[PDB]
Amino acid sequence: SMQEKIMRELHVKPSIDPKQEIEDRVNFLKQYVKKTGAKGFVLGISGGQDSTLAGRLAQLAVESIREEGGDAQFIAVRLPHGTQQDEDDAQLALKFIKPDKSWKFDIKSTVSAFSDQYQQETGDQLTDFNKGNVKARTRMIAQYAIGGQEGLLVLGTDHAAEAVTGFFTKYGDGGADLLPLTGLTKRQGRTLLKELGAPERLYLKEPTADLLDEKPQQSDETELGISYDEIDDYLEGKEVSAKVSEALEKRYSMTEHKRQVPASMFDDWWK
Amino acid sequence: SMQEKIMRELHVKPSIDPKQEIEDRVNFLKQYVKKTGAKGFVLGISGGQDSTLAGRLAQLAVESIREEGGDAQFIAVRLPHGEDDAQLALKFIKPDKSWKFDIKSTVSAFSDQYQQETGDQLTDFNKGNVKARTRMIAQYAIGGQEGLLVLGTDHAAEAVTGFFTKYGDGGADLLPLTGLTKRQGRTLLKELGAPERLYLISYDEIDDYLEGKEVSAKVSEALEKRYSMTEHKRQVPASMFDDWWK
Numbered sequence: 172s173m174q175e176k177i178m179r180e181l182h183v184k185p186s187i188d189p190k191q192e193i194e195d196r197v198n199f200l201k202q203y204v205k206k207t208g209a210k211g212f213v214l215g216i217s218g219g220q221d222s223t224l225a226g227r228l229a230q231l232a233v234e235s236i237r238e239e240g241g242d243a244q245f246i247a248v249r250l251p252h253g254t255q256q257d258e259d260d261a262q263l264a265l266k267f268i269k270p271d272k273s274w275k276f277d278i279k280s281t282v283s284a285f286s287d288q289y290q291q292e293t294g295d296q297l298t299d300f301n302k303g304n305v306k307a308r309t310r311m312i313a314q315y316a317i318g319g320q321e322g323l324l325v326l327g328t329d330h331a332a333e334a335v336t337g338f339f340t341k342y343g344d345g346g347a348d349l350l351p352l353t354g355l356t357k358r359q360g361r362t363l364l365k366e367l368g369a370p371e372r373l374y375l376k377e378p379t380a381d382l383l384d385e386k387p388q389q390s391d392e393t394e395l396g397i398s399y400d401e402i403d404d405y406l407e408g409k410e411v412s413a414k415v416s417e418a419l420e421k422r423y424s425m426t427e428h429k430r431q432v433p434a435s436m437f438d439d440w441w442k
Numbered sequence: 443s444m445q446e447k448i449m450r451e452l453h454v455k456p457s458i459d460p461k462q463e464i465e466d467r468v469n470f471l472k473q474y475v476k477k478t479g480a481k482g483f484v485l486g487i488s489g490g491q492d493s494t495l496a497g498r499l500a501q502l503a504v505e506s507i508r509e510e511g512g513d514a515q516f517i518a519v520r521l522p523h524g525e526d527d528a529q530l531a532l533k534f535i536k537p538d539k540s541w542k543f544d545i546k547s548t549v550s551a552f553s554d555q556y557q558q559e560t561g562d563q564l565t566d567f568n569k570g571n572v573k574a575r576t577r578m579i580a581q582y583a584i585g586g587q588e589g590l591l592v593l594g595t596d597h598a599a600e601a602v603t604g605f606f607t608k609y610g611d612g613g614a615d616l617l618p619l620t621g622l623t624k625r626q627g628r629t630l631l632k633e634l635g636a637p638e639r640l641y642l643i644s645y646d647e648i649d650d651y652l653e654g655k656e657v658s659a660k661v662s663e664a665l666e667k668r669y670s671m672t673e674h675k676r677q678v679p680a681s682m683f684d685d686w687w688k
């Protein structure tokens with residue numbers, strides 16, 4: 172069964188124990204830190220559900236490590252491109268996460284320098300969509316710069332509901348060192364945030380990439396054409412309409428390249 | 443045996459037929475592009491051995507596809523930070539298109555912004571990684587604008603040591619040089635008829651290790667340690683369901 176295969180590959184559990192999931196994921200963060208001797212984590216905080224959840228998990232892991240006598244820190248970073256329309260949500264997220272450190276890095280001048288150079292070098296102007304991907308990749312650079320400067324690992328917010336659609340920028344937000352949210356569907360992530368006591372605003376808002384200058388705050392569902400609820404039912408193994416299966420299985424096959432290391436002639440997944 | 447395990451995982455062959463290797467690798471590029479419907483490839487050309495080799499294979503692949511009546515193009519891009527060898531490489535590769543994207547203004551802006559926001563200046567090392575990642579962005583910007591796949595120049599000798607920037611020069615779509623040792627790549631370049639100026643622990647020691655030849659315990663222990671330490675660069679981001687990191 173395709174549904175069954177996609178579920179196993181994305182590590183989705185049809186039924187979770189919220190409390191245990193948090194314990195498991197915080198323990199994963201701690202184990203990884205100890206194994207690598209890293210000093211902690213850095214994660215861009217957007218004000219959206221995913222980074223809010225990953226952020227809180229990283230803070231809990233770091234506090235748990237210190238409590239045991241270890242040394243670890245967590246730097247949450249605001250990465251606006253100029254003014255962020257929902258900056259207030261990002262600030263709310265920070266108030267909830269309570270990170271050790273809250274930094275900010277405005278990516279606008281870097282993206283502008285890039286775009287200008289692009290037009291200068293090719294005579295062409297970057298399309299809104301392509302510039303959006305430059306923004307996502309510039310955020311990865313900003314996080315790795317901070318991680319490299321301070322000796323921290325970069326957390327990624329990828330989870331099953333976005334992995335299934337390849338709904339992330341290759342080497343942009345998809346570029347991270349570890350993924351604490353792997354296998355969680357969108358509603359399961361929301362369940363974890365409720366368990367953690369997060370303000371409802373953070374999980375009630377519409378998921379957005381917010382990468383376009385022409386259409387800022389464009390909802391994921393708008394670009395995708397499927398709702399997160401249909402995506403989650405599928406991932407959780409619920410019998411869904413053939414229209415959902417067909418759309419998702421098609422999207423999954425086309426984005427396999429985003430879930431694998433660069434392709435070589437010795438790889439079969441692409442044939 | 444660690445040497446044997448590594449050799450198997452990196453797909454290195456003890457000996458190669460240079461003519462056949464070129465054919466197989468050109469075929470891989472043609473096959474991948476055809477499977478995907480992409481319009482061609484983009485590759486940053488530095489004047490170095492690896493990109494010169496990857497570039498020539500890409501140009502041959504694109505010419506092969508057009509020969510079969512298809513549509514494919516190769517854009518070689520110079521990515522200076524603000525050139526003689528790169529020019530020699532271009533003369534040898536003869537790409538359909540030869541572009542340039544100076545990354546200095548982007549890196550400077552990032553660098554100034556980092557100092558403003560943090561109060562810290564980016565150290566040389568970290569600034570080097572920013573340059574590698576900016577090159578990745580430029581290649582993908584071009585690829586995204588033109589509908590091309592980004593080629594990576596990673597090979598076995600570079601993969602064992604993790605000597606590349608994660609999401610920088612390591613960020614690519616396909617890897618035509620996978621499994622090749624440094625010396626084997628030199629052999630392919632010679633076979634292709636590249637000028638010597640382009641293809642000319644000990645890097646030759648790394649090659650011996652990868653090809654399954656006997657090396658000192660010092661070489662082995664060194665490489666095997668560096669290999670396990672860089673596993674994270676050869677895998678997708680780690681999750682609790684992954685085992686390789688434990």
Ligand SMILES: Nc1ncnc2c1ncn2[C@@H]1O[C@H](COP(=O)(O)OP(=O)(O)OC[C@H]2O[C@@H]([n+]3cccc(C(=O)O)c3)[C@H](O)[C@@H]2O)[C@@H](O)[C@H]1O
Pocket residue numbers: 304307337338339340341342343344379380381382391394425428434478582585586590591592615616
């Ligand atoms: N089959 C293939 N094999 C190997 N590589 C392949 C490939 N097909 C394309 N490629 C490459 O992949 C590239 C396309 O992938 P990518 O560059 O990711 O670009 P793309 O998928 O076209 O854009 C990223 C998308 O994910 C989204 N996203 C991004 C960032 C954040 C969020 C969020 O909600 O915050 C959502 C977004 O809104 C957009 O819909 C191509 O230019 C190409 O170089």
Ligand SMILES: Nc1ncnc2c1ncn2[C@@H]1O[C@H](COP(=O)(O)OP(=O)(O)OC[C@H]2O[C@@H]([n+]3cccc(C(=O)O)c3)[C@H](O)[C@@H]2O)[C@@H](O)[C@H]1O
Pocket residue numbers: 207315318319323324325348349571574604605606607608610611671674
């Ligand atoms: N075990 C772990 N699990 C998950 N992630 C881990 C990790 N340990 C560190 N990390 C991370 O990855 C990082 C370090 O890797 P990375 O950022 O690649 O940085 P790094 O390994 O420091 O890359 C720079 C270097 O690679 C070489 N290089 C660089 C650029 C180009 C080329 C060329 O020849 O063209 C060669 C070179 O010999 C050199 O000094 C961290 O800052 C951290 O985020």
Ligand SMILES: Nc1ncnc2c1ncn2[C@@H]1O[C@H](COP(=O)(O)OP(=O)(O)OP(=O)(O)O)[C@@H](O)[C@H]1O
Pocket residue numbers: 214215216217218219220221222223248249250251252255310328344377378379380381
């Ligand atoms: N404006 C920004 N400020 C800080 N970090 C950012 C910014 N925009 C995106 N990111 C980051 O890159 C990511 C990918 O963004 P994405 O929109 O998929 O996630 P999210 O916003 O946390 O939640 P949702 O997916 O529900 O919108 C993050 O989750 C976050 O770490």
Ligand SMILES: [Mg+2]
Pocket residue numbers: 217219378379380381
């Ligand atoms: Mg968002």
